[PDB]
Amino acid sequence: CHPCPWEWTFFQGNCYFMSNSQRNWHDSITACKEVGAQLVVIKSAEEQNFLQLQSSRSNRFTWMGLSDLNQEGTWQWVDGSPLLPSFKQYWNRGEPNNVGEEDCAEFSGNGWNDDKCNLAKFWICKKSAAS
Ligand SMILES: CC(=O)N[C@H]1[C@H](O[C@@H]2[C@@H](O)[C@H](O)O[C@H](CO)[C@@H]2O)O[C@H](CO)[C@@H](O[C@@H]2O[C@H](CO)[C@H](O)[C@H](O)[C@H]2O)[C@@H]1O[C@@H]1O[C@@H](C)[C@@H](O)[C@@H](O)[C@@H]1O
Ligand SMILES: [Ca+2]
Ligand SMILES: [Ca+2]
Ligand SMILES: [Mg+2]
Questions:
Q1: Ligand 1 atom closest to Cα of residue 115
Q2: Could you tell me which of 104, 9, 91 has the C-alpha nearest to residue 58?
Q3: What's 1-131's CATH class?
């Protein structure tokens, strides 16, 4: 028994995969579902620190499963859970600024940034480690 499928990274009971191509927010969600996963929904500060490193390391702008599409200002993860105040510190300073309507969150630099959902970016999928 191995926790994750080949090519997927194991971290604290969960499996992660970062794309090698760029897609918009909605397409990234579909990309993850197609591999039995979900555009990464962060559940803890530790997980955030882990994921942020992968983006700041490779110096890549990456999608996460978070948006305020349904209600401007109200950020919600793709699984329905609301963005806890515990995570506000992660937005880069000045973010989220919603310029030109930015309703999708990405890992950008050392923190998060809200950007155009239709912009193509890399994405990270997450799914629980095998039983
Ligand atoms: C207000 C705005 O549109 N911010 C842009 C910024 O735009 C300015 C204009 O406001 C000003 O009049 O002219 C200058 C050029 O002389 C400039 O166009 O332009 C920057 C650079 O393109 C842009 O930041 C970049 O945003 C992209 C988004 O994909 C990416 O994050 C990149 O790393 C940034 O450097 C500003 O965009 C906004 O601010 C960013 C900090 C971020 O919050 C973006 O989501 C915003 O759209
Ligand atoms: Ca917004
Ligand atoms: Ca922004
Ligand atoms: Mg909107």
A1: 45
A2: 9
A3: alpha beta
